[PDB]
A paper describes a structure:
Photosystem II (PSII) of cryptophyte algae associates with alloxanthin chlorophyll a/c-binding proteins (ACPs) to act as the peripheral light-harvesting system, whose supramolecular organization is unknown. In this work, we isolate the PSII-ACPII supercomplex from a cryptophyte alga C. placoidea and solve its structure using single-particle cryo-electron microscopy (cryo-EM). In addition, a special Chl a-binding antenna subunit was identified and named as cryptophyte Chl a-binding special protein (CCPII-S) in each PSII-ACPII monomer.
The overall structure of the PSII-ACPII supercomplex is a homodimer with a C2 symmetry, and is composed of two PSII core monomers and twelve ACPII subunits, with each PSII core monomer binding six ACPII subunits. The PSII core is composed of four large transmembrane subunits (D1, D2, CP47, and CP43), thirteen small, transmembrane subunits (PsbE, PsbF, PsbH, PsbI, PsbJ, PsbK, PsbL, PsbM, PsbT, PsbW, PsbX, PsbY, and PsbZ), and three lumenal extrinsic subunits (PsbO, PsbU, PsbV) involved in stabilization of the oxygen-evolving complex. Among them, ACPII-1/2/3 are associated at the PsbX-PsbH-CP47 side, and ACPII-4/5/6 are associated at the PsbW-CP43-PsbZ side, respectively. Unk3 associates with CP43 on the stromal side of the PSII-ACPII supercomplex and interacts with the nearby ACPII-5 subunit, facilitating connections of the ACPII antenna subunit with the PSII core. At the stromal side, EET mainly takes place through three pathways; one is mediated by ACPII-2, CCPII-S and CP47 subunits, the other one involves ACPII-6, Unk3 and CP43, and the third one involves ACPII-3 and CP43. Thus, the CCPII-S and Unk3 subunits previously unidentified in the PSII-ACPII supercomplex may have crucial roles in mediating EET from the outer antennas to the inner PSII core in the cryptophyte algae.
Author numbering:
A (entry chain w): 69 to 113
B (entry chain 4): 53 to 224
C (entry chain i): 1 to 35
D (entry chain 3): 45 to 222
E (entry chain 2): 44 to 216
F (entry chain 5): 32 to 73
G (entry chain a): 10 to 60
H (entry chain S): 115 to 171
The structure:
Amino acid sequence: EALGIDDTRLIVPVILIPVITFILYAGFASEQDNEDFFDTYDQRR
Amino acid sequence: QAIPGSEPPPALDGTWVGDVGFDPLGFSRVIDMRWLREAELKHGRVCMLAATGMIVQDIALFPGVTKTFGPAKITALHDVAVKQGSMQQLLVWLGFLEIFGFVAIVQMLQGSGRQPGDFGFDPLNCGANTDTLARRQLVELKNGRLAMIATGGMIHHFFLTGKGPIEFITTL
Amino acid sequence: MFTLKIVVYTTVTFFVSLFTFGFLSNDASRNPNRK
Amino acid sequence: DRSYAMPFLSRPPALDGSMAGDVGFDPLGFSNYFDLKWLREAELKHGRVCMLGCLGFLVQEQANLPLPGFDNKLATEAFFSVPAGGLWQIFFSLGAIEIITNKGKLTPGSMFTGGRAPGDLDFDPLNLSVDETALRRFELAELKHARLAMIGLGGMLHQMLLTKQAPIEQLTNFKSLA
Amino acid sequence: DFSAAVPFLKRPSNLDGTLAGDVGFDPLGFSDVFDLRVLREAELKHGRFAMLAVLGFLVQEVYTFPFFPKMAPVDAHDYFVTQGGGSQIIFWISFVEIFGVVALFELIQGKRDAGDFAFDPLGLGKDEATLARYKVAEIKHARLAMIAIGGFIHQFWVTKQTVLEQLGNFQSL
Amino acid sequence: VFPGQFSDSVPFLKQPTNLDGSYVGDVGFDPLGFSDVFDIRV
Amino acid sequence: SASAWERFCSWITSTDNRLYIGWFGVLMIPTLLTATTVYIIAFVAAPPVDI
Amino acid sequence: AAGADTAEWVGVSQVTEDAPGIGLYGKYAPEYDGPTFREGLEYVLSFAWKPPILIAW
Amino acid sequence: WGGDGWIVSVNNMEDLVGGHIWIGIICIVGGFWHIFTKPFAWARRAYVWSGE
Ligand SMILES: CC1=C(C#C/C(C)=C/C=C/C(C)=C/C=C/C=C(C)/C=C/C=C(\C)C#CC2=C(C)C[C@@H](O)CC2(C)C)C(C)(C)C[C@H](O)C1
Ligand SMILES: CC1=C(C#C/C(C)=C/C=C/C(C)=C/C=C/C=C(C)/C=C/C=C(C)/C=C/C2=C(C)CCCC2(C)C)C(C)(C)C[C@H](O)C1
Ligand SMILES: CC1=CCCC(C)(C)[C@H]1/C=C/C(C)=C/C=C/C(C)=C/C=C/C=C(C)/C=C/C=C(C)/C=C/C1=C(C)CCCC1(C)C
């Protein structure tokens, strides 16, 4: 049983919720600069 | 001038075959004139051939066709010939021709220079000169409309009575 | 028992998704020495 | 200043007539409170999904792939008959398509910030709609087909849910409700 | 300035006489308080419903569709409560009057005439004199049918027989 | 039948844009315009 | 001006909250509250267990 | 090499320009500068909790 | 958990060898992937790029 899933209705939230969170995160990331930097971390937000 | 009370659409301003100003609903206001005239000639020619073929079918059949198709005409003939593959062959080859007809319509609408219904099919140079060509255009359009109404009449007569054209008009 | 299971799966997925996409959101920049 | 679709209602302020498919049909005033680019993008996406969906509804019953679990003319039951792993693979592939074709701009506040027409996903392999008037005619045709396909997909799905019969088969075997 | 219809009552201050059927009849004075445009909208819609209902009663008594069972119009209401056709009818009425709400809001804002949905598909009324005459006839028929539909329903309730059936044998009780 | 320039093979279709006639076997037969979308050499 | 997710991340990682939440707190707070609730109720009134 | 970029490869349609629904420009993409998405959701909610119905009477 | 054991419960050598084939294929494909690519923008924002 993959991910403890025995009913196919359980897959709907497990896949769906990360999609919506990724949509919000993708709006955030599209707001960003997204070019390469030479440093230990990116100070641009 | 067809209907004295009303007026023709501004697309109907002469310079077209059969233009008697008859378009009360206003199809030419929203549809291009070339597409309309091409469709009119296509429907007219299809109905001309259909009516003549139906008359011939109710008069005399081909040798050996009654053994397979039986005593079936019009709609039963179609229902048997779709299973036989005759209508399938007709569909394939006529759609193959309509591919070239389609690109002809496209080139007409984008401005190649051809007129609606002009496929260049003039064997024996019949009616290719002077005012005879325009008279043949008018005759073709009027006879196409007449054959359209007649084809509808034949189909609905077989729907109502179950008899062919030449036997319905003699057995009222 | 299935309704409770799907509610729990939805809640766990929601909070784990928030965690995962929050630490992906340039967490190293969120320090007082930035800029 | 009455709308063309609703002669008894005034024309919506955001529906001037420059956008394609506009006959002034916004009775509830969605364009006054939502981005019209977002609304048109959603309308076109729904309509394209529904056009392909109606095509699938008509095709699946007459022809199906020769695969186990792929023999079900009723598409609603075919959703549960096809293995779910392939359905989720379809879901993730379409999600990747959505990611790529929007350049990672998915929220309403970021989708049109880079500059993009609503529904313009850069898909014209035949290089059509270079002509502006042809572009307008094709846009009107696309919108009319989108709305018609949304309505048709809804109707066919509801009829398949109720009568348990696939389309055109339902037309040839018309069984009225009890 | 007394009322033209009621000679002992003053003419209501909001009934100038420009509306169709405005004869000055308003004893209780609902036009003094509530908006006249909304009241005319309600009057016209009540009347249109009642006219369709009276014509429907006549037709249903004289002819029922062969795929529907044969019965009286009034007790068919419960049959279509159970069957589901009445739910469809009120569903589509609600769908039309969802936009009716927007039309009423525009009427409140003053950008629409009362009862004017611009529904003239056959082009019967285009001349202004004919339009005014048709407005007067429409409001008179609306009032007459508003009375008549209640008459039909109550006569069926007391006599247990339909309209033309009661006109057949006039039983008095 | 009507005056105008058309293809040698099909008389109701014009000569295609990229079928100039330099290549052999070219009777001007390209109704769907495959030569307009892709290169004539390929 | 910022996106909704950016404002959510600014609130989660905010130093102005009385108790700091953070992304680890996103996982921590509901888990610890669930454990606390179940522990309190099971310590007060839970039937005997066949250990 | 081809591109169909010659000035004859244009789309065709039977519909004239005078038919309703045809816009003025090809791809307009209007500038919004209006109420936010949250305010739009609040408006859709006000469809439910304050419809313009009893304001008539 | 008990009765399932995740990947500790491999109970035959066929699964072991087949999944080692899978691991080798995945590792080689990913190695060429990392030889020929540079980290994406989300990975560049996510991680700290230092030896420690
Ligand atoms: C864009 C683009 C391209 C392209 C493309 C493509 C792929 C274009 C595809 C377009 C498609 C597939 C359009 C499909 C529309 C379907 C509709 C409207 C269905 C309506 C259903 C109805 C009315 C119904 C119904 C019914 C109901 C509800 C009840 C039933 O009892 C009865 C019934 C069945 C009648 C190409 C490739 C050319 C290149 C170009 O450069 C760019
Ligand atoms: C509930 C229910 C149903 C129902 C129902 C329905 C729809 C019931 C409807 C009942 C209605 C519409 C009654 C209307 C009565 C009107 C009257 C008395 C007007 C009198 C006017 C006068 C006297 C005018 C007087 C006058 C005035 C003022 C002005 C001029 C002078 C004069 C002419 C004298 C069903 C059928 C659906 C079934 C369901 O299971 C149960
Ligand atoms: C089947 C079996 C029997 C016995 C032998 C055999 C080898 C065959 C065995 C197994 C075969 C196979 C195919 C094994 C595959 C194992 C795999 C895919 C292991 C991968 C584990 C992935 C892990 C930890 C991911 C860790 C990354 C995390 C958390 C997140 C990092 C970050 C992101 C992306 C989100 C926010 C937080 C942070 C830190 C910025």
